[PDB]
Design a protein around this ligand. Structure first.
Ligand code: NA
Ligand code: NA
Ligand code: NA
Ligand code: NA
Ligand code: NA
Ligand code: NA
Ligand code: NA
Lengths: 263, 264, 267, 266, 269
């Protein structure tokens, strides 16, 4: 598509979308399950549906506009919704203190004119399996790296686990995304939030996200760590059967649009 | 409301409000309790009044001003008041050293023309309860997420626990807020403070907080971690009965105002 | 006072003050005790003189300005260089027997400096008044059954002597009008300190109107406190119950200040 | 070479290269072995081929370009990003703490873009005790001290078997190259990987001159070690399971390099 | 001296110095010992030569300037910016292993990262942190024994780093001196703190003051000083971080600190 000039700003040529994407521990491709804590995360060699956080997706329809004019997203405000977890996450008997949330984390958002492109990799393919309800890589004896043989798909269903699928920097042409992954078994999360920040979506030529299909595609995943059961001990072998993934309560998006002429 | 021009600055067309919001571990709606350490935090299934930190609110009336002129808050200085805690927090017997303050944290302030809008979510509703003296989510079988069915309220009383209520980004239109949450069981807090920094409150159009009701609404919550009892061991099973939430001693606000012409 | 223009710069109308403020574990008001490690910090319910780090203060007289009174000329501090003096602590702090390695310095921290035209205004709060006492040699809050918060009943005064413990006294943001200060507190029982230093950085002291610290009393007031953590005794185990009797607060060796002045007309 | 003016930008005078460099636990100089986890890292006195992460190299051909001066491609900026996913149970579990182990430990994040191979210095950190296996490049055995002095072994990364535990970028060379590295120590340090598709890094020096591809190719080199991990379904971070503990690398490092044309004179 | 204008830049009026300062665990003043790991660090009350990291110094002579002295003015070399970078590699099994945690030990512990560039030697202050209990071995420069307190006051021992035997556990840069020098340091405490080393070949640091004046090489040389301690390590193939292997724990330094210093000429009176 050839990109031409923006349409002069006025009440009729601007738009905004607000959404909260909810944490998703899907059971299957067409069954997102919205809950902020997973089912207990078992220590088996298999990634299980219900305990493994998946990307959340939202496709938000934009108004029809009467060469062609399309909506162009030029900035986004995005913020996580969360509260501090003390006793809600159980307690550490050995330290006589609330456990809180801690562990490995992922903070991720994307805004695009089409679905998020991802690469699916099994990190320990001699040993690790992906349950039938979740999208896993193809079984083609490919190595555990992001090469030409790696499985590539788009996030168009509820069951893409974040422990398998990474954003594909070789695609995602008409999309902006940002991610941060933190390792460690007990690492503290840090969640900053407010209502004053905004992120531009325009490239070096001043071009934002062109909504050529008349919708905006929002994708997110926000894992903050692991937690136990409220009122119970945790962070011990004895209570390993109750340890669960904690996600944020939601990721807010406010996307701002103008109109762009394209050919 | 239609926002028009600012009034030319002069002695009579500016104002400032100073306040220190004090930590609050309320026992009920109409009873804030100002203390910087909570009652001991018990490991039960219930969030209890007295041991769970709640938002602190202040509504500060602004002078009458003789289309309509209103006070517009355009910037704020806000700072935490605290001191290092060593032996005041107990000691760790196994490590032969003062315990200090450590654990999960929240640092939060808001400035607005009306009360802070919040979302209330029970993070483990099958197991966790909120005591009668605290505001809890409605019991409508909603899932534990910030969706359409999540309980939405305004912070208009002393008994909104931070372990339940988060600022609502779908609302708070005439308000600026900033928050930071740190997890972990024993995470060290970091508190920086001074008297040289300021934060603007104006949006993209140069418009600050319009005090349409003739008052500025300040809201804060500042949890620095957990502590034990001075002179006693802590961070062990044996002394969990004494472990308490530590808040800052206060959050200072200095809010600066000009006047703005508006049309209702 | 009403602030007017700066006096044009020249050899005669600028000045600088250099000082190193030394760590102070005072035993009383008029006898600062300069040492970089406190007496062993006991686990009693009392903050003890000798083991608790106190603010350090220096009041430095500035030159008389000839024909100052007419409008009056005063010295105006408009920027400051300030840096901590320290060295890495390995075996000097003892060793951790269980981990077979030098202990170093670790624990809760405070880094603080202030520059002003009068003493630092502070608020004094006992964090656990049902249980904790302040020893008689140190300035403590008044005993007026006030809650342990920074409210209107909290004890307020100025740091004018050697015996204000940092575990009690915090800078007062409702006062300190002709003073700039910056503090950072770090919690945790074993937190590593980080000390960055150099001789290239400078901090401005001017407000939004371009006005720095006006030295109306004829002196610059410097206040500091720099606690880096806890340490043991060289050659001995530490970080254990058995050696808790030897655990002491470590401060920096000094805080350097270089304050730069010009002249300002007021009335 | 004398550097002259850039060629006016147009469709025919600009180019870009995309590549994903893959983690390499080489068995020998002849063959990179692309895998994101090493073979188990044994606690012997020898660095072993297959368990030690090596630099990855890619030489990417650029198009031929149609007085005594020449046009060459000039790389003026680069987008580079790591491809990874969070590791929970895929890394085993910590039995004592009843929780997934994740990835943690010492780290290295490194990229280079150049007109010729990366210049490196090879140092044995403990030469009285530590050996380097025959399948990996090690320093010369010339009784040199364990420091980066004039006697240290200097080589270029032109093969698959340069272990990052021995070979560091040489700041005395690497003239027509930009590189950036970060090493993090500690036995259990959490890695932090930030990524996105909005960031770009300039490659131009103080004279506005980028990487001059005098040989008609761009040389990319990387290494990205994120920590250690165990086996999925098994305990780890204990003596009992030390025989399974393995180095974890990123799944790949993406590069997108942007070029213009520069007039030069040999 | 009175500083005047810079000399117009040209091939003949610019210069650069490159050096790699190597880690030094000296046993005496005139005998630097270049090695990146010290001898085992004993837990005695004495800082020992061979196990304590000392500053490394390089004094590099600059070229004579033709007709440098003329009328009442003199040309001198002025250092106006510096690139400096640490040379290191990740340490896994090279540092031993932690038996209890079934993993390589790596490098961890207290750290110091320091560089200085000047027209004369680095001015330092020497302080014994625990003078009732701690001694400095005879081969190393230590504070004077004058009953001075353990602080940076007027009785603290002051001198310059002019030899190989100034331990970093004693000697700190002196902010009351170092007039014609720029320095930068960072100390990190803790018993097991991870080091973080960032490096590249794109960064440069200016050496000019508020008046645009860099380091004036009035003595005809550039003085480079560095110290880079990254933590502690064990022995390759052995357990570490335990009481049983404490006798093998050693300080780990960087393999070198690179400097590239850039000069122009400055007229002085
Ligand atoms: Na499983
Ligand atoms: Na549409
Ligand atoms: Na409870
Ligand atoms: Na005591
Ligand atoms: Na080995
Ligand atoms: Na070519
Ligand atoms: Na010793």
């Amino acid at each position: 598509v050839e990109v031409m000039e923006t349409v002069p700003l006025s009440e009729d040529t601007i738009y905004k979308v607000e959404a909260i994407l909810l944490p998703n521990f899907a059971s299957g491709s067409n069954t997102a399950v919205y809950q902020s804590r997973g089912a207990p995360y078992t220590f088996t060699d298999t990634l299980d549906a219900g305990s493994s956080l998946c990307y959340t997706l939202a496709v938000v329809n934009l108004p029809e506009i009467p060469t062609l004019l399309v909506w162009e997203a030029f900035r986004v405000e995005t913020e996580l919704i969360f509260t501090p977890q003390l006793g809600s996450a159980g307690y550490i008997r050995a330290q006589g203190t609330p456990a809180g949330v801690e562990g490995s984390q992922m903070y991720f958002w994307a805004c695009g004119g089409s679905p998020l492109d991802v690469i699916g990799i099994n990190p320990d393919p001699e040993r690790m399996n992906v349950a039938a309800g979740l999208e896993g890589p193809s079984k083609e004896n490919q190595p555990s790296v992001a090469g030409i043989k790696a499985t590539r798909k788009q996030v168009t269903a509820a069951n893409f686990p974040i422990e398998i699928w990474s954003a594909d920097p070789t695609r995602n042409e008409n999309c902006r995304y940002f991610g941060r992954i933190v390792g460690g078994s007990v690492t503290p999360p840090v969640v900053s939030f407010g209502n004053q920040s905004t992120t531009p979506l325009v490239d070096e030529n001043g071009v934002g996200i062109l909504c050529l299909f008349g919708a905006i595609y929002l994708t997110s995943a926000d894992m903050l760590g692991m937690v136990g059961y409220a009122g119970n001990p945790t962070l011990s072998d004895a209570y390993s059967q109750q340890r669960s993934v904690q996600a944020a309560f939601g990721r807010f998006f406010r996307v701002h649009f103008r109109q762009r002429r394209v050919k």
